[PDB]
A paper describes a structure:
Far upstream element (FUSE) binding protein 1 ([name] or FBP1) is a multifunctional single-stranded DNA- (ssDNA) and RNA-binding protein, which acts as a master regulator of diverse cellular processes including transcription, mRNA stability and translation as well as RNA splicing. Central to its single-stranded nucleic acid (ssNA) interacting function of human [name] is a tandem of four K homology (KH) motifs, namely KH1, KH2, KH3 and KH4, which is embedded in the middle region in between the self-regulatory and transactivation domains at the N- and C- termini, respectively. Comparison of the four structures showed that they all adopted an evolutionarily conserved eukaryotic KH-domain architecture, consisting of a three-stranded β-sheet packed on one side by three helices. A common property in recognition of up to four nucleotides is facilitated by a ‘minimal KH motif’ that constructs an ssNA hydrophobic binding cleft formed on one side by two short consecutive helices (α1 and α2) and the GXXG-motif-containing connecting loop and on the other side by the domain’s β-sheet and the variable loop that links the β2 and β3.
In addition, we observed also a unique, additional small α′ helix at the N-terminus of KH3. Of particular note was KH3, of which the short and compact β2-β3 variable loop and the presence of α1 R284 resulted in the more-enclosed, positively-charged binding groove, which was likely enabled also by the unique glycine-to-asparagine substitution in the GRNG motif at the upper part of the pocket. Since this motif was essential for ssDNA binding, we questioned whether this substitution might be a contributing factor to the distinctly stronger ssDNA-binding affinity observed for KH3. The results showed that the mutation did not exhibit an adverse effect, yet on a contrary slightly enhanced binding to ssDNA of ~ 1.7 fold was observed. This suggested therefore that the unique glycine-to-asparagine substitution was unlikely responsible for an increase in the nucleotide-binding affinity in KH3. As expected, in contrast to the wild type, all mutants did not show a shift in migration on native gels upon incubation with the selected ssDNA.
Author numbering: 277 to 348
Write the structure that this text describes.
Amino acid sequence: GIDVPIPRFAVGIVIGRNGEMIKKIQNDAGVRIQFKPDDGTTPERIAQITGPPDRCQHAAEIITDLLRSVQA
Ligand SMILES: [Zn+2]
């Protein structure tokens, strides 16, 4: 898969209420998304996207479009 950096203040809207948004991204793109553990201090969190390259790129694009729509 691929690693997408997410600004810390925006992680909430990528995951969504009770993980609804990360479920919708997984469901629409057909991928698995997990956040890498970090020490909590870092300005970005890393979303690890697992799957074939095309699906991973579609999931990365969906996450990008979310972030851009709120200027993250
Ligand atoms: Zn787009």
